[PDB]
């Protein structure tokens, strides 16, 4: 659903200041060769050749590590999240956007992303990048840029008397559709989204139900960095498999449970399901080398185990006796 | 005559494209109303236009040479003629005043036309007395001179004695984006190339040079005439007495059918027949038909203070 | 039902690009002699003499084998279908047209088929071919050309930013009223048909009910290439014979069951019917040499037998116990 909601006059100066702060000290850049882009990490290649270099140079710089979390290993993500929650003393807010790529306006697209790319890249490459942006208007970096712009707008609205550089220095971790911010702008974020024309969903941090971030649940971010898959999103749908019909059910289930072990080995109410899938569909599945040579293969802390159990129960609103009964039923099947 | 083939052979064309990325963002833009309600103010409209051109120039990635690439906003007075702006053969964008009404209220600043000059009197700012240089008339190709140093002037002196001149070409577009301020337009230009032209030879494409408009009607002295085009393919005419506030908009067809009548009584009867009952309309129509001349006085005016 | 629904302005460039890609490297051609046309494979001859040569030259060339499946042996058809399904990972869509020859518009006829024929054949033969096309307006190749044009239109609408040659290189197998395409344009195909003015029927591939193509059912195209006659179309009508009244019923039934053996020897719920027809009408039928000398004669993998049985049951929505009861009833009659 395309939208053409231009922002107000005042917000334009805030957006320009945010873009300039994003530029930082990297005035000049050069495009990457086709071979280097191909070995990095059709239609994706032509934009990737420039966008990967732009991200790696500007968005992964010294003065842009405060907010651009997108682009780091999951261990690095967990470390950053724990550091941010320690800094904010467990006072953080979560942002959940609905169809951001389908809702970003033309003015935002042509005044944030296009401006940033043109300022980052060399003048001799202006025509190619502008043509690529025009083709885009009619991937990953766009969401991060939108999140950074919205964070800058919120910070500018919260403290209009501070210098833009100091305001932007407080930008918390942001990664695409998910991000973190101070809880003091919980109500003012909705007005900023309305001014830009975006829809924002915000939820106050609650230790009883855990914290939601990148479909990951932090059981107790104050002390431990233990983290698990989001139970709210996956439990209601994990019993149904959305793989293509051509794949046997056993191979898809095996890949799903292998990923779950790789990410959620010691999570209550999921380990039992994964083990029962491995016990039932496991022997009936095909050879694992066969599925490793098949395209659809990629189409999918012990100390606080008690606390993780209680946090999962709080997340799923299931009584402990009910949880034990469910665990017994799952294991005995 | 053979002069045509002679000139055609004398092409001397040197098209230049200095990575002038087309400003398609400025082109084909939906009109918008700046003010939330009521009506806008000259400052507000100017700020909106500046924002639009600034964001366009930022998106295209190029620079500009702002005058108090080339950009100018409400600088008709500051610029004696557009030829000085065009001689650089660079992209030029203007936010000018090319009214579709002979007189009335422009934005929030009333205006009137005395002689061929516009007695513009901004609500906030100095009153402007400048003509209009025929921007929005039919045609996309324009002829303009080119900047040349005095030394080059001396060099061409023998060459210009015969009647040779260096002429630049441009492409034109405007938008009229504000409905509340239709009298203002957003001119757009694109230089094409340069050639040498003989003074005493015609051109195929009927390229025109920007000229001062002649609003006065020789057939109706003391009156100013003007007509424009409408969204629904309607040709409306705006008329009013020179240096005076009143004006009226009417279809050129009805004005044509009225003009040839003989008796003012017949004129009034025909006006009544079409259902027009406003005296302010029929009386002005009759006044124009009879060509009544009145010596309008010059009286002091008391304006508002700007409310920023 | 003649139709005169001209396409939109934008679609004309897509159609011209598709026609040029169809032309490929075969700029010049020559007509075939009458004797050669007669020995190839009245009113049919005059058009066939040119259309057979045009098909053999252009439509059977190196750069036009990606889509023009029509014109190959059934073993070749099965190999192509299995290769295409392996390439698409069992993610394919089927197109079923209703009265294409009775629904193609004048603009389509004069801008696809006529253009292709004129570009393929020599200039000195322009008058004859144009007269033949004019007579046609007021056989096999036309359906293939229409299917290719619709595939090109769908591909152009899906990816408007790619080069036409690269877009056309992705054209999947097409054969007259039947063809294969990517499932990612399942919804956009209807809009393309509406723009051209054609009616399209599309069905998502379902492994449970098999895949429909050329009235052939692929029991498990992911692994095996075993294929059978379409059960949906034939089972509801196989008990009734549509032969002319002059032929005895026995000869028509014998020819039908001989064809079924030649194509569907090991298909469940059809082999029993064929054998019972051979047992009942067989001895009562006339001499087979007599029907071989009679005009109306031509007017008609064991390893996965279990899987074929289950696929036929899924196709016919008949319970396995019900299937066994039906098989017992048919055999004992």
Please classify residue A292 by burial: count the beta carbons closer than 10 Å to its beta carbon, then call 0-12 exposed, 13-18 middle and 19+ buried: exposed
Distance of CA A132 to the CA centre of its chain: 24
DSSP β-ladder status, B92-97 and B70-73:
parallel
Q: Are strands A200-204 and A92-97 parallel, antiparallel or unpaired?
A: antiparallel
Closest CA relative to residue C333, chosen from C286, C271, C285, C273: C273
Of C74, C150, C80, nearest to C112 by C-alpha is C150
- The whole-angstrom separation of Cα C253 and Cα C257 is 6
Q: Collect contacts of A7-11 with beta carbons under 8 A, ≥24 apart.
A: A7/A105, A7/A107, A7/A108, A7/A195, A7/A196, A7/A197, A8/A195, A9/B47, A9/B48, A9/B51, A11/A153, A11/A195, A11/A196
CA pair distance C163, B97, nearest whole angstrom = 45
CA closest to C183 among chain A residues? A244
Structure tokens at A253: 């289930």
The values of phi and psi at residue A211, to 5°, are: -115, 135
Report the alpha-carbon distance of residue A220 to residue B290 in Å, rounded. Answer: 91
Residues 6+ apart with CB under 8 A from B109: B42, B120, B121, B122, B123
- Is there a contact between A245 and C89 if contact means CB atoms under 8 Å apart? no
Give the integer Cα–Cα distance in Å for C286 and C294: 11
Distances (CA, A) of C150 to C19, C202, C205: 12, 13, 20
Closest C-alpha among B210, B201, B245, B239 to residue B223: B239
The torsion of the CA quartet C222, C227, C230, C231, rounded to 10 degrees, works out to: -90
Would you call A246 and C90 a contact, using CB atoms and an 8 Å cutoff? yes
Which residues in chain A are contacts of B30 at CB distance < 8 A?
4
| Residue A124 DSSP symbol | G
Contact assessment for residue C119 and residue C19, using Cβ atoms and an 8 Å cutoff: yes
Q: What CA–CA distance (Å, rounded) separates C193 from C199?
A: 6
Are B148 and B115 in contact by the 8 Å Cβ rule? The answer is no
Cβ(A271)–Cβ(A265) under 8 Å?
A: yes
- Interface partners of B (3+ CB pairs, < 8 Å)? A
Chain C residues within 8 A of A295 when measuring between CB atoms: 89
Chain C residues with CB under 8 Å of A244 CB are 89-91
Flag whether residue B30 sits within 8 Å of chain A, measured between CB atoms: yes
In angstroms, what CA-CA distances link C183 with A32, C205, C213, C251?
Answer: 34, 8, 15, 44
CA–CA min distance A278, chain C (Å):
24
| Distance between B277 CA and the closest CA of chain A, angstroms | 43
Helix ranges, C65-139 (H): 74-87, 106-108, 114-120, 126-137
* Cβ-contact B51, B73 below 8 angstroms: no
Eight-state DSSP code of residue A63: G
In A38-57, the residues whose Cβ lies within 8 Å of chain C are 43
Task: Report helix, strand or coil for C108.
Answer: helix
Are B47 and A115 a contacting pair at CB < 8 A?
no
Token look-up 């500009």 returns B64
Put simply, the answer to whether A9 touches B59 (Cβ < 8 Å) is no
Alpha-carbon distance of C268 to C131, in angstroms, equals 50
Q: Indicate yes or no: CB of B51 within 8 angstroms of CB of A4.
A: no
Among all residues of chain A, which has the CA nearest to that of B24? A134
Element (H, E) at B176: none
Give all strands of the β-sheet with C178-182 in edge-to-edge order. Answer: C174-175, C178-182, C92-97, C200-204
* Residue A59 backbone dihedrals phi, psi, to 5 degrees: -70, -15
**C-alpha–C-alpha distance, residues B31 and B184, integer Å:** 12
CB contact under 8 A, C161 and A43: yes
3-state SS class at A89: coil
Residue A230's Cα: distance from chain center in Å? 13
Q: Is the dihedral of CA B186, B191, B197, B202 positive or negative?
A: negative
Side-chain-side CA neighbours of B225 within 13 Å: the count stands at: 13
Count of CB pairs separated by less than 8 Å, A with B: 30
User: Among residues 181-240 of chain C, which lie with CB inside 8 Å of chain A?
Assistant: 205-208, 222
CA distance A291 to chain C (A): 13
CB C172 within 8 Å of CB C147: no
CB atoms within 10 A of CB B98: 21
Cβ contacts of B49 on chain A, cutoff 8 Å? none
Of B249, B250, B243, give the one whose Cα is nearest residue B222.
B243
Rounded Cα gap, residues A203 and C239, in angstroms: 66
**Which residues of chain A lie closer than 8 angstroms to C206, CB-CB?**
245
Experimental method: cryo-EM
Give which of A272, A253, A283 is closest to A333, Cα–Cα.
Answer: A272
Which residues in chain A have Cβ-Cβ distances shorter than 8 Å to B48? 9
**Under 8 Å CB-to-CB from C56, ≥6 apart: which residues?**
none
In B158-212, at which residue ranges do the beta strands (DSSP E only) sit? 164-173, 184-198
Nearest to A126 among B55, B58, B61 (CB): B61
* Neighbour tally for A246: CB within 10 Å: 21
Cβ neighbour number for residue C171 with a 10 Å cutoff: 23
Residue C158 dihedral angles phi and psi, to the nearest 5°: -70, -45
Q: Which of A251, A245, A243 is nearest to A300 (CA)?
A: A243
Strands A216-218 and A200-204: unpaired
The phi, psi pair for A244, rounded to 5°, reads -70, 155
**Residue A65 Cα distances to A49, A58, A81, A165, angstroms:** 22, 10, 13, 14
Q: What's the CA gap between B68 and B75, in Å, rounded?
A: 7
Nearest to C185 by CA among C112, C67, C91: C91
SS3 B44: helix
Residues belonging to chain B: 308
Measure the CA–CA gap between B100 and B183, rounded to whole angstroms.
6
In chain C, the largest separation of any two C-alpha atoms, in whole Å, equals 68
């Amino acid at each position: 659903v395309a939208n053409d909601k231009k922002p107000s006059d005042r917000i334009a100066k805030i957006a320009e200041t945010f873009v300039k702060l994003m530029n930082g000290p990297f005035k000049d850049l050069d495009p990457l060769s086709i071979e280097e882009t191909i070995e990095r990490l059709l239609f994706i290649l032509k934009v990737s050749r420039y966008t990967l270099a732009y991200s790696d140079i500007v968005l992964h710089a010294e003065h842009n590590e405060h907010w651009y979390y997108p682009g780091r290993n999951p261990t690095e993500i967990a470390d950053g999240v724990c550091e941010f929650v320690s800094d904010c003393d467990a006072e953080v807010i979560e942002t959940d956007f609905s169809n951001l790529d389908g809702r970003v306006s033309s003015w935002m697209q042509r005044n944030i992303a296009q401006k940033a790319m043109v300022q980052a890249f060399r003048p001799e490459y202006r025509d190619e990048i502008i043509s690529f942006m025009d083709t885009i208007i009619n991937t990953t970096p766009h969401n991060t840029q939108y999140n950074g712009c919205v964070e800058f707008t919120a910070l500018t609205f919260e403290h209009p008397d501070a210098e833009p550089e100091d305001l932007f220095r407080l930008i918390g971790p942001k990664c695409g559709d998910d991000g973190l911010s101070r809880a003091i702008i919980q109500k003012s974020i909705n007005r900023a989204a309305k001014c830009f024309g975006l829809e924002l969903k915000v939820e106050r941090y609650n230790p009883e139900i855990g914290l939601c971030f990148l479909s990951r649940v932090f059981v107790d971010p104050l002390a431990t960095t233990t983290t698990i898959q989001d139970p709210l999103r996956t439990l209601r749908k994990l019993h149904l498999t959305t793989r293509d019909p051509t794949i046997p059910l056993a191979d898809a289930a095996c890949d799903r449970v292998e990923g779950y072990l790789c990410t959620d080995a010691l999570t209550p109410l999921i380990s039992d399901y994964c083990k029962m899938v491995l016990r039932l569909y496991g022997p009936t599945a095909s050879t694992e080398q066969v599925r490793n040579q098949r395209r659809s293969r990629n189409k999918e802390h012990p100390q606080d185990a008690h606390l993780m159990k209680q946090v999962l129960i709080k997340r799923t609103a299931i009584d402990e006796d009910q949880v034990d009964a469910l665990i017994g039923r799952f294991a005995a099947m | 005559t053979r002069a045509l083939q002679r000139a055609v052979i004398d092409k001397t064309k040197t098209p230049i494209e200095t990575r002038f990325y087309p400003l398609d963002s400025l082109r084909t833009v939906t009109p918008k109303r700046v003010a939330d309600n009521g009506h806008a103010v000259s400052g507000a409209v100017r700020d909106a236009a500046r924002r639009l051109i600034d964001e366009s120039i930022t998106a295209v990635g190029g620079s500009k040479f702002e005058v108090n690439f080339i950009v100018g906003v409400d600088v008709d007075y500051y610029v004696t003629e557009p030829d000085v702006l065009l001689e650089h053969m660079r992209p030029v964008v203007l936010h000018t005043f090319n009214p579709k009404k002979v007189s009335g209220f422009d934005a929030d600043s009333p205006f009137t036309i005395k002689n061929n000059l516009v007695e513009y009197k901004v609500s906030g700012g100095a009153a402007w007395v400048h003509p209009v240089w025929d921007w929005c008339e039919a045609g996309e190709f324009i002829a303009s001179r080119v900047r040349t140093s005095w030394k080059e002037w001396f060099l061409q002196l023998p060459l210009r004695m015969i009647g040779l001149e260096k002429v630049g070409y441009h492409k034109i577009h405007h938008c009229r984006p504000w409905t509340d301020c239709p009298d203002r337009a957003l001119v757009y230009t694109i230089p094409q190339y340069v050639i040498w032209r003989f003074n005493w030879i015609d051109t195929e494409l009927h390229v025109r040079k920007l000229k001062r408009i002649e609003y006065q009607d020789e057939t109706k002295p003391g009156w100013n005439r003007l007509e424009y085009v409408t969204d629904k393919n309607e040709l409306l005419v705006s008329i009013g007495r020179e240096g005076e506030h009143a004006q009226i908009t009417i279809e050129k067809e009805k004005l044509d059918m009225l003009s040839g009548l003989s008796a003012t009584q017949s004129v009034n009867a025909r006006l009544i027949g079409m259902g027009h009952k406003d005296p302010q309309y029929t009386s002005m129509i009759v006044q124009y038909y009879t060509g009544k001349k009145v010596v309008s006085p010059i009286s002091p005016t008391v304006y508002k203070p700007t409310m920023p």
